[PDB]
Nucleic acid binder design. Structure first.
Ligand SMILES: Nc1ncnc2c1ncn2[C@H]1C[C@H](O)[C@@H](COP(=O)(O)CP(=O)(O)OP(=O)(O)O)O1
Ligand SMILES: [Mn+2]
Ligand SMILES: [Mn+2]
Ligand SMILES: [Mn+2]
Ligand SMILES: [Mn+2]
Ligand SMILES: [Mn+2]
Ligand SMILES: [Mn+2]
Ligand code: NA
Ligand code: NA
Length: 326
DNA sequence: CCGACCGCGCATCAGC
DNA sequence: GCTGATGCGC
DNA sequence: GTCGG
């Protein structure tokens, strides 16, 4: 964090463009510029120094020059102050409330936790849960507690069928001291490309995790994806652990490695990879690795037995999960 | 100087 | 009632 | 907002 002040600035700018301006590409743009600087090995002494890097253009060098000089950004003070921009910004921190919804509420005077509290009957199931665990959801998860969760998940999965291979991923697999949530990749022999579609492969496990009382709430549940709420059990009469977010995705067996790659990220890493795999002549997606023909056609899915295998195809130094945090 | 930058699985709901 | 349109988190 | 075309 040699350039920490700059990348924090870039980040707030991102959220702004994404939550208020509803311009997902400026968001990405700032998001990208930050990751590039947050990986530069020197301490940025000017905006021009930063302008050398790919992802940092004129406006960001200009902003960097102010931040360096002044010590703050005028454009951000304005944002920070403006009530509306400031309010939409807040709402989006509730799970289930994105730009559009937050912008709507604010336009109807609802702009704070208390307001959502008053107008509760004007929120979908997901937004209610969101508000209900507002504080809980913004808390990071100690890597230790993850382990205890990685134990209850992996375990309970076995109890449904010993053939299930539940692999915890995300920044956790990347070996992180804490994680925003718990992402679980799930597979089973009876489910691959072909499959004939096995009904309730995910249902049974979701169900079982609710049996022991580990999964307390459902934000969404389909045939291959579940977004919900879980909670580590408490000793006796201590204090309930914070309620945590859990995502579980059932992927076809012969796509595991490719999916385990995607779901481990980092997200920006994935932006990076699904980008250099094109200059090499391929096209990665969370499900497969495909070659690009003449005009660029989805060639058949190449065989994959390791993450390393995916790197080989695109000729990139194999990087361990821990070094993919970008 | 202009246009691409992943798009997908799920829930909800305007319009009929 | 059904469903195309859209919003949401990742 | 950026950078490649
Ligand atoms: N916009 C995006 N484009 C492409 N891939 C994306 C993505 N957002 C998320 N991903 C992929 C890679 C993440 O590692 C993986 C997990 O997505 P995630 O949002 O659960 C966050 P994680 O990386 O686990 O850290 P943490 O904040 O939760 O502790 O999902
Ligand atoms: Mn150097
Ligand atoms: Mn009020
Ligand atoms: Mn995660
Ligand atoms: Mn997740
Ligand atoms: Mn333009
Ligand atoms: Mn439909
Ligand atoms: Na540059
Ligand atoms: Na949100």
């Amino acid at each position: 964090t040699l350039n920490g002040g700059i990348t924090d600035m870039l980040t707030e700018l991102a959220n702004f463009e994404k939550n208020v301006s509803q311009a997902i590409h400026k968001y990405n743009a700032y998001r990208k510029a930050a990751s590039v600087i947050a990986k530069y090995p020197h301490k940025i002494k000017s905006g021009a120094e930063a302008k050398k890097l790919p992802g940092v253009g004129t406006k960001i060098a200009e902003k960097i020059d102010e931040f360096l000089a002044t010590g703050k950004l005028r454009k951000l003070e304005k944002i920070r102050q403006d009530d509306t921009s400031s309010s939409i910004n807040f709402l989006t921190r509730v799970s289930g409330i994105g730009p559009s919804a937050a912008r709507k509420f604010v336009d109807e005077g609802i702009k704070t936790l208390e307001d959502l509290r008053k107008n509760e009957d004007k929120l979908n199931h997901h937004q209610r849960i969101g508000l209900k665990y507002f504080g809980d959801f913004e808390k990071r998860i100690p890597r230790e507690e993850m382990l205890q969760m990685q134990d209850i998940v992996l375990n309970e999965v076995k109890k449904v069928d010993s053939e299930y291979i539940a692999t915890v991923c995300g920044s956790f697999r990347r070996g992180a001291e804490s994680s925003g949530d718990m992402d679980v990749l799930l597979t089973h022999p009876s489910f691959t490309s072909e499959s004939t579609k096995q009904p309730k492969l995910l249902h049974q496990v979701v169900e079982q995790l609710q049996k022991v009382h580990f999964i307390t709430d459902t934000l969404s549940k389909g045939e291959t994806k579940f977004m919900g709420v879980c909670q580590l059990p408490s000793k006796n009469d201590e204090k309930e652990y914070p309620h945590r977010r859990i995502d579980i995705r059932l992927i076809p067996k012969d796509q595991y490695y490719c999916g385990v790659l995607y779901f481990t990220g980092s997200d920006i890493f994935n932006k990076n990879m699904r980008a250099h795999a094109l200059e090499k002549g391929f096209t990665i997606n969370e499900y497969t690795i495909r070659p690009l023909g003449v005009t660029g056609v989805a060639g058949e899915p190449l065989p994959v037995d390791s993450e390393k295998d995916i790197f080989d195809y695109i000729q990139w130094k194999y990087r361990e999960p821990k070094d993919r945090s970008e």
